[PDB]
Symmetry: none
Subunit: 63 residues, 6 copies
């Protein structure tokens, strides 16, 4: 009834670093899903029935 | 009735780092899902019946 | 009725680091699911009947 | 000088005035490499007397900071030095 | 100075300037390399009396911080040095 | 000077200026490599007298920080040195 929010976080992704000092990487993906980078994904819903926040690097072949 | 939310976190991801000095990596993915990068995902779902949050590096082949 | 929350945490992931000096790695995934990196997934759900938070590096082949 | 309050209120919230650091802060190298800190003399009711008839007198607040000197026989910090070589 | 109160109210909650570090802080090298630190002087009722007929007198607070010197027979810190070699 | 309270309330909450560190703090090398710390001096009611003829008198508080010297027969710290070699 008397709501006082102050710096309240709801669905927050923060401070997501990566450091790659002299990193060698080779990818030869053929027909699939490959993720090697940083994915920082935050979400918030109201009346969000059946909601997903990440679908990183996946292969969907539903029949 | 008298609610004071102060600095309250609810579905929060933070401070997710990676350091990769001298790293060598090879990925030869064929038809699948490969994940190496840092994934940081938060979600605050209201009225979210049946809510996924991550789907990182998987293979869905239902029927 | 008289509720004050100060710096609370409901569904929080924080401080997740990896350090990989001199690290060599190979992944030869063929039709599967290889997760090798950081994941950090937090969730707070209200009225979320049947809520999943991680789907990391698996294979779903339901029939 | 900071101040915060909440007066004649039904449901009050004061505040910090304090630092937060919520995010990346890459530093390549946060190096001090020969520094000094803090030395500050506060003099009060002093009665110094100096009588020099051909030398050297200093009444400072000494502090030296260097990184590199070069050269044969060089001298870097010489507080109270008297160099009188016969040749 | 920091203040944060709550007065003449009906409900209250206050903060206080507390630091928070909620995130990533990479540092490559947080090095101190010859750092004299923490000294601080207060002089009161000083009664210096100096009489010099060809020397050196210092009344600081000697605090040296270096990293590198170069040269044959070099000298780095020389508080109270007399240097009178005969050739 | 930090103060943070709460008075005349139905339910009182008060923070207290406390540090938090909730996250990654990578440091590659948090090294001191020859530093000075914690030394401090305050002078009071001193009665220094000097009668110098060609010497050296320092009335500091010595504190040397240093990393590297080289050269043939070098000298690094020389508090109270009388270098008068004959040749």
């Amino acid at each position: 009834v008397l709501y006082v929010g102050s710096k309240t976080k709801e669905g927050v992704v923060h401070g997501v670093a990566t450091v790659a000092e002299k990193t060698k990487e080779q990818v030869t993906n053929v027909g699939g899903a490959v993720v090697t980078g940083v994915t920082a994904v935050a979400q918030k819903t109201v009346e969000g029935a059946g909601s997903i926040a990440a679908a990183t690097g996946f292969v969907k072949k539903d029949q």
